Write a protein that binds this ligand. Structure first.
Ligand SMILES: CCCCCCCCO[C@@H]1O[C@H](CO)[C@@H](O)[C@H](O)[C@H]1O
Ligand SMILES: CCCCCCCCO[C@@H]1O[C@H](CO)[C@@H](O)[C@H](O)[C@H]1O
Ligand SMILES: CCCCCCCCO[C@@H]1O[C@H](CO)[C@@H](O)[C@H](O)[C@H]1O
Ligand SMILES: CCCCCCCCO[C@@H]1O[C@H](CO)[C@@H](O)[C@H](O)[C@H]1O
Ligand SMILES: CCCCCCCCO[C@@H]1O[C@H](CO)[C@@H](O)[C@H](O)[C@H]1O
Ligand SMILES: CCCCCCCCO[C@@H]1O[C@H](CO)[C@@H](O)[C@H](O)[C@H]1O
Ligand SMILES: CCCCCCCCO[C@@H]1O[C@H](CO)[C@@H](O)[C@H](O)[C@H]1O
Ligand SMILES: CCCCCCCCO[C@@H]1O[C@H](CO)[C@@H](O)[C@H](O)[C@H]1O
Ligand SMILES: CCCCCCCCO[C@@H]1O[C@H](CO)[C@@H](O)[C@H](O)[C@H]1O
Ligand SMILES: CCCCCCCCO[C@@H]1O[C@H](CO)[C@@H](O)[C@H](O)[C@H]1O
Ligand SMILES: CCCCCCCCO[C@@H]1O[C@H](CO)[C@@H](O)[C@H](O)[C@H]1O
Ligand SMILES: CCCCCCCCO[C@@H]1O[C@H](CO)[C@@H](O)[C@H](O)[C@H]1O
Lengths: 230, 230, 230, 230
């Protein structure tokens, strides 16, 4: 390969994840009477990873998420020296998606990124269901770890080949089905950053949480698989 | 093979796509209280491609969509000389499905293709959610491109064999989960043409949009995979 | 094998299909506020076939449906001399499921098989959405044929191995997403017979329709694949 | 392997099953207007098994359920001498998940495990839909058996390799789509025990039912496959 091809793969991948997951949230989740709800948004997120893990996993590894890249580092599956590049690529790709999404959302009368939240992640006063900071920590930490345990397990040498995109993408949908009401569903700092920039207020103030927690969580997940299961 | 067998495969395939996707929209999406919604219609579309990509992909390649055929051309995966045949086959198959659908829908009191839209694609005044022409362009262009990037990636030499119908069909569902509110969900000019003919007014007047945009989009998608990822 | 093992497989399979599909309809579809709707029932039907096609397909072929058995006969994939046995096994298995379902449904105050329809298939006055006999014919005929075209295609020599239960089971879900409002969703005479016996009135009077149409449809589907695609 | 690695795999697996299935029920099922419903909870349960069967099935066998372990024993697929260890591991993992879930749920004003039921399984007066003890028996018994018949079938020597997590996990979703209204959906004594401890009243009093029935059911399922199908 070239590192170029993979960075491009991680960029387009993460663009897809934010464009489709958050796009479904901003455009479709709450459409009157026929809209897709939390379940639909959780399905869309998972499908973005399933579809691009099959399309470009064989190029980059198909992370699309800085907590994945860093957790694969910690699990001994990914070299330290490529981490930063992946993370930049992921972040940039997400930003470009959020931008196009914002443009799309603006073509409907009454749109307002700041007031609606633009699908940004938050806790306490900004949890969709009114959950505390501690509820948000526990849920992003466990779900992050489990996501990474699934990613390690499903790509294990002895895991039957080819199925990983289904396991990994459906694991993200599951995570969505649990967590939207607590944090508006992250486990991914590039996904949180992308839309926080356009929400423009509280989302930027809590954004640090959705860097630290999902990463510590993904590190833990990696360490669990490597030291206890592999 | 014979070119006959494949054209038949592309025809039946596209018939299935319109009969099931648009059929679910016209018959089931809005059924009171128990109807399937946008999420259900997005699932049905994706399943039509998943199921016929597994059934007849090994015959024709399983495009079922003129933007797919033309994007595979641009991506260097499909010969120029078979394009037109595929596109005619796709269009004809879709028309026959729309016709049977119209017959089916007419067996219920109060049906009216023109007033309900017969699941036709539109923008501005005819976007289901009131989105502008520019919102519609950006969304059909990005989603078209991404669809084709997924189709190229998932059928890459190095993509694990056999899984492509799942990636491709679920990618279409994802696209549905995002876009119904903006354009009533196209990325497919045969799907747009099929029902526009029976809607019979505005749908025919905007039909040109849902030829040009999804194609330019599918070309871009192909060019991205070929020049930057493959 | 023994013919015993396969008949048992076809019996348990069809029991599963009726117990889960119709069970989900009678127990869960319309539960206030949280019930699963037409989409949920369509998913359950498809999952019964996906799960038992993986569990016992390698024994019997995994038909679970007299229109499948007879359409595989017509498509040249299944010997005439085993048809009747399969069909009896399928019918018996469905009846035993309907019976247990009726017992389960009766443990809730107010249950009434005859008035609710017990998820029976009907047309005209007994179509859930008020569709005519002709709308019901066209929809059961097309969907039956397509189901059988998918079953033939997905189990073709050149179809990648192992995936057929996913294609076939998801094809049934798709069929459910389209057709519930027209006929309450059949494409399967054992599924129609099972519950008609407990509905006990109109369902028995229209039951003949849901033998003839799905079969003619499944025959057509088989003939299409064999003569035009294979 | 080490028995350690597998017990860890069964523990984390079952933790995932309770954290995600019951978590989705307690956090997301009934969220106003956008919540995921019974269908969403049934999807989440199934996805927990699909995702961890792919991640750790190759280590432990991926049971995550004492009725699975004991039914595989009865079906001649799993040695008597490892049963108890698995069952303890499963139970412990579920308890730790219920505990974290309770902590998470408590960060929202008005939460109350005892009054809401904390997603506990019950019958009669504690069936979500008002079903009798007999309705609950028949449904947990049939669904348990079928679950185990699917698990045996899908992991049969002659079942195509690698697909079992999809069959098994989707079988659990199906089971969820049928049974929530009757028993709040068990077929798993560790899943019932986990949350009963935090519900703290009636759930503990009926907990015995959701040990005995799912086990007798899973034994029957195993015996059916071994003696009649294999
Ligand atoms: C990988 C490159 C992106 C790094 C993520 C940026 C983390 C943002 O951190 C945020 O920014 C502000 C800093 O003054 C604080 O006010 C906020 O409370 C905090 O959320
Ligand atoms: C990779 C890009 C990361 C961007 C992180 C920027 C952190 C923004 O920080 C935010 O700045 C805003 C005004 O400029 C204010 O509304 C907030 O109070 C402040 O926390
Ligand atoms: C990687 C992005 C920054 C992570 C720093 C870890 C510790 C930060 O700690 C937090 O920083 C917040 C934002 O400024 C403060 O508002 C909080 O009081 C503080 O607890
Ligand atoms: C592949 C064969 C089908 C070609 C697609 C036809 C494109 C239709 O183009 C349409 O038709 C009219 C032309 O006068 C215009 O009035 C409409 O505004 C335009 O949508
Ligand atoms: C492959 C078949 C493509 C059919 C495209 C036909 C373009 C139709 O064009 C339409 O004709 C209608 C009346 O005849 C009018 O209602 C519209 O104003 C006009 O744009
Ligand atoms: C392939 C089908 C036609 C594509 C032509 C590309 C440029 C068309 O351009 C458009 O044509 C519309 C329909 O007539 C006009 O109404 C619009 O003003 C015009 O912008
Ligand atoms: C495979 C064995 C089962 C055969 C299916 C039975 C078809 C039932 O046929 C039915 O029965 C009655 C016959 O007098 C008629 O009154 C009904 O209108 C007709 O639906
Ligand atoms: C395999 C079993 C098939 C059973 C088909 C039986 C056909 C029943 O036929 C029905 O009998 C009922 C009363 O007995 C009446 O309500 C109906 O008018 C009559 O059509
Ligand atoms: C396989 C089950 C019977 C199929 C017979 C095919 C032709 C039946 O024909 C139909 O029979 C109905 C039921 O008696 C009558 O009520 C209808 O008038 C008649 O059209
Ligand atoms: C594998 C280790 C856990 C065993 C499961 C415990 C079964 C609980 O059994 C319960 O406990 C009480 C006993 O006095 C009774 O009052 C309850 O009615 C009964 O549900
Ligand atoms: C593996 C752990 C299994 C725990 C099973 C414990 C059985 C509890 O039993 C319950 O005790 C409660 C008060 O302590 C009472 O509310 C109930 O009446 C009683 O049945
Ligand atoms: C494995 C957990 C205990 C299973 C014992 C099987 C028979 C129990 O039997 C039941 O025990 C209940 C709980 O105490 C009583 O309340 C019921 O009356 C009794 O029928």
């Amino acid at each position: 390969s070239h590192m170029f091809r993979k960075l491009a793969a991680e960029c387009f991948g993460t663009f897809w994840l934010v464009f489709g997951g958050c796009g479904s949230a901003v455009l479709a989740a709450g459409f009157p009477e026929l809209g897709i709800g939390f379940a639909g948004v959780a399905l869309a997120f998972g499908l973005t990873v399933l579809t691009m893990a099959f399309a470009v996993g064989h190029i980059s590894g198909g992370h699309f998420n800085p907590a994945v890249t860093i957790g694969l580092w910690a699990g001994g599956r990914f070299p330290a020296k490529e981490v930063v590049g992946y993370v930049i690529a992921q972040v940039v790709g997400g930003i470009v998606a959020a931008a196009l999404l914002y443009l799309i959302a603006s073509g409907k009368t009454g749109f307002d990124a700041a007031a609606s939240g633009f699908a940004s992640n938050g806790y306490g006063e900004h949890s969709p269901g009114g959950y505390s900071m501690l509820s948000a920590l526990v849920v992003e930490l466990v779900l992050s770890a489990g996501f990474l345990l699934v990613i390690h397990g499903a790509t294990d040498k002895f895991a039957p080949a080819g199925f990983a995109p289904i396991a990994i993408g459906l694991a993200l949908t599951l995570i969505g089905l649990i967590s939207i009401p607590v944090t508006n569903f992250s486990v991914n700092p590039a996904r949180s950053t992308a839309v926080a920039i356009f929400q423009g207020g509280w989302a930027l103030e809590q954004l640090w949480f959705f860097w630290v927690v999902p990463i510590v969580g993904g590190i833990i997940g990696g360490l669990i698989y490597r030291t206890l299961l592999e």
